[PDB]
Amino acid sequence: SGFRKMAFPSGKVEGCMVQVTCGTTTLNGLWLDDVVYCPRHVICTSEDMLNPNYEDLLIRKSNHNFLVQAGNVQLRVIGHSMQNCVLKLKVDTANPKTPKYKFVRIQPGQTFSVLACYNGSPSGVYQCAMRPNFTIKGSFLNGSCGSVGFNIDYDCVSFCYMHHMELPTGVHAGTDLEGNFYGPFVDRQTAQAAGTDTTITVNVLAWLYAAVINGDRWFLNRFTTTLNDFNLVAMKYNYEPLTQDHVDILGPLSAQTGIAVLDMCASLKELLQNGMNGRTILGSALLEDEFTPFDVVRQCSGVT
Amino acid sequence: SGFRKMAFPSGKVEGCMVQVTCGTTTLNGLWLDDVVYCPRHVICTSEDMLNPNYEDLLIRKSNHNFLVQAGNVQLRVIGHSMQNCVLKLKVDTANPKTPKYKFVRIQPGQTFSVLACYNGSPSGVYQCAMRPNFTIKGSFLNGSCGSVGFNIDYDCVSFCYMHHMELPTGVHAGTDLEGNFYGPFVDRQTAQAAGTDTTITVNVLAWLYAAVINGDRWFLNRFTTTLNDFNLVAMKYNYEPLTQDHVDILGPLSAQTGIAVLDMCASLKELLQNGMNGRTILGSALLEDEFTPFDVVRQCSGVT
Ligand SMILES: CO[C@@]1(C(=O)Nc2cncc3ccccc23)CCOc2ccc(Cl)cc21
Numbered sequence: 350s351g352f353r354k355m356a357f358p359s360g361k362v363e364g365c366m367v368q369v370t371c372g373t374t375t376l377n378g379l380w381l382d383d384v385v386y387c388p389r390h391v392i393c394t395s396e397d398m399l400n401p402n403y404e405d406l407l408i409r410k411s412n413h414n415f416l417v418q419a420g421n422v423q424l425r426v427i428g429h430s431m432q433n434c435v436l437k438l439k440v441d442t443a444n445p446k447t448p449k450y451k452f453v454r455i456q457p458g459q460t461f462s463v464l465a466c467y468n469g470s471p472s473g474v475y476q477c478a479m480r481p482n483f484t485i486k487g488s489f490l491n492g493s494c495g496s497v498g499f500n501i502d503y504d505c506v507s508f509c510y511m512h513h514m515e516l517p518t519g520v521h522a523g524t525d526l527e528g529n530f531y532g533p534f535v536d537r538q539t540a541q542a543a544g545t546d547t548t549i550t551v552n553v554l555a556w557l558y559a560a561v562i563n564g565d566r567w568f569l570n571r572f573t574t575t576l577n578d579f580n581l582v583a584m585k586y587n588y589e590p591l592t593q594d595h596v597d598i599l600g601p602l603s604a605q606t607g608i609a610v611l612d613m614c615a616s617l618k619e620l621l622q623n624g625m626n627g628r629t630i631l632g633s634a635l636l637e638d639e640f641t642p643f644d645v646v647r648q649c650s651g652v653t
Numbered sequence: 654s655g656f657r658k659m660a661f662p663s664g665k666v667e668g669c670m671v672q673v674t675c676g677t678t679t680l681n682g683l684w685l686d687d688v689v690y691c692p693r694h695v696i697c698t699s700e701d702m703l704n705p706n707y708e709d710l711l712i713r714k715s716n717h718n719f720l721v722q723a724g725n726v727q728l729r730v731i732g733h734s735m736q737n738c739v740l741k742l743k744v745d746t747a748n749p750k751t752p753k754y755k756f757v758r759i760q761p762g763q764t765f766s767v768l769a770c771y772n773g774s775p776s777g778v779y780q781c782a783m784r785p786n787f788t789i790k791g792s793f794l795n796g797s798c799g800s801v802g803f804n805i806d807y808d809c810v811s812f813c814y815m816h817h818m819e820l821p822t823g824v825h826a827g828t829d830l831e832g833n834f835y836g837p838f839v840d841r842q843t844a845q846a847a848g849t850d851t852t853i854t855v856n857v858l859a860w861l862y863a864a865v866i867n868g869d870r871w872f873l874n875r876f877t878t879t880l881n882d883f884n885l886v887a888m889k890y891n892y893e894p895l896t897q898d899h900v901d902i903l904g905p906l907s908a909q910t911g912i913a914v915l916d917m918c919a920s921l922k923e924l925l926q927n928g929m930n931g932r933t934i935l936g937s938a939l940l941e942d943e944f945t946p947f948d949v950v951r952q953c954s955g956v957t
């Protein structure tokens with residue numbers, strides 16, 4: 350029992366963290382095999398960020414202009430290329446600590462762990478989610494760029510995020526491991542606004558199922574609702590529309606607790622309309638949406 | 654910018670996690686040098702837990718009765734001893750992944766990272782704090798016993814907690830790495846009640862300083878207070894008494910923001926008396942007390 354915003358063990362990802370320097374700029378890189386991945390804005394100065402032509406900036410950069418430092422040893426860059434908003438630096442030595450990996454592009458709503466790094470050194474690890482507006486609410490300072498987001502399936506690291514930008518609103522924007530940004534964000538120092546942040550409904554339902562599993566059952570009511578009725582209420586509260594797929598995914602948690610998914614929706618509906626009334630659920634005074642139904646089952650079963 | 658309940662990178666602690674079996678019981682152990690530490694209740698059956706004489710139970714256990722499995726290889730137990738509520742199994746092979754370590758007994762209020770394990774395999778990592786009633790609000794299932802709590806100073810792991818027990822209230826009880834329980838808890842299956850959980854005042858103040866640093870400044874008021882006046886209010890709300898030492902420790906965050914510690918106390922006083930009024934601070938609808946002032950500076954400066 351107990352329910353925490355538990356991140357994946359980061360050891361397998363720490364072994365991939367390197368420091369990438371280009372001129373004055375220094376950020377983090379992810380060394381897997383003989384390739385180091387990092388945000389392509391490593392080639393920019395602060396003046397270049399305002400309006401950068403990365404193709405042009407890159408021309409005035411050679412293999413020796415990139416300094417990759419793993420731990421305290423220097424790596425030899427034997428090739429360089431730009432894949433979307435990431436630089437792929439081919440080094441002459443394969444990472445001896447390269448785990449089994451996949452580069453996956455997650456969907457908004459999915460949650461991953463972030464290993465925040467500075468100078469190729471991991472400083473901490475936390476769990477976060479891809480917001481429906483394709484931002485993350487991370488904890489990143491200057492020099493955290495190149496830090497990755499990941500999931501782990503037994504011994505396989507699925508890299509899904511690379512940190513590039515902090516938006517003026519304090520939210521974070523980044524790319525998948527193929528250099529493509531999540532959302533409309535561009536790696537330019539220009540005013541970019543984050544869209545509406547909606548609440549990932551299926552996740553709040555999953556954390557309500559998690560609460561019932563841990564004894565917090567006060568919010569359980571005598572009512573039920575329909576998918577369409579629940580969604581009219583969800584719409585008003587800027588909550589994601591709940592679909593039959595979401596109900597399907599909640600099936601396991603519905604079976605575990607014996608509470609139908611539409612009964613849980615009615616409890617959520619009353620929580621949305623009536624408020625928490627001073628009470629807490631899993632020590633939280635608000636509805637938590639950064640636990641997928643997969644995170645709840647994993648934490649309440651013990652998947653290692 | 655951004656503020657998360659960020660745990661330390663767990664890689665250095667994953668390399669110490671082993672599976673310890675004794676008869677039918679299987680829990681986790683911490684292998685540092687040629688010693689594997691684990692909860693002494695590994696020698697008990699479910700009937701023994703009701704009233705165990707560990708000295709007597711241990712007599713009917715020999716070196717070969719303990720099965721330590723690291724990864725997928727078996728370790729040879731060449732000696733065994735009981736230090737308080739922990740078993741110290743001396744193995745013939747020193748852990749090649751043993752980091753620089755210290756065994757430290759933390760004070761209530763201090764926060765550490767937990768690497769939750771099952772069968773010697775790390776399943777996840779989260780940050781938590783030693784409650785003033787010497788319990789932790791962890792996330793532990795059956796088989797998580799032997800999971801450790803730790804802090805990291807650059808390359809040195811300070812082990813401070815070992816998980817032993819879940820109390821009927823869903824809170825967790827454990828020992829330091831010398832086998833001594835935090836609080837009055839005993840490793841017996843007998844009704845043990847957790848005392849009053851108070852709010853770690855100095856930590857809530859630190860997370861208020863962290864909020865101001867991240868732009869959330871709505872709670873800042875035009876008032877100040879005295880230490881004695883603040884404490885009368887803190888007492889009523891079951892908040893820890895604030896001492897001059899706590900004010901001293903908040904000095905750095907006071908200097909960073911230019912907000913005096915007693916001005917921040919007045920903001921906290923109004924937050925306690927008036928409530929959040931529907932608003933959030935750092936995305937939280939309640940006052941967070943599981944960030945020490947050291948955690949705030951570390952997260953807002955980038956200590957790796
Ligand atoms: C190159 O770094 C930028 C940035 O936001 N990086 C950051 C990312 N995280 C946390 C940050 C905390 C403080 C300072 C910067 C942070 C600086 C502003 O202009 C831009 C413009 C585009 C891009 Cl792709 C990045 C950036």
Ligand SMILES: CO[C@@]1(C(=O)Nc2cncc3ccccc23)CCOc2ccc(Cl)cc21
Pocket residue numbers: 350694702793794795796797798817818819820839840841842843
């Ligand atoms: C030996 O394990 C016990 C326990 O609480 N362990 C646990 C610790 N964490 C999470 C748990 C989740 C579910 C089941 C047990 C959990 C079982 C009950 O009796 C006792 C009595 C004393 C002690 Cl020192 C431990 C224990």
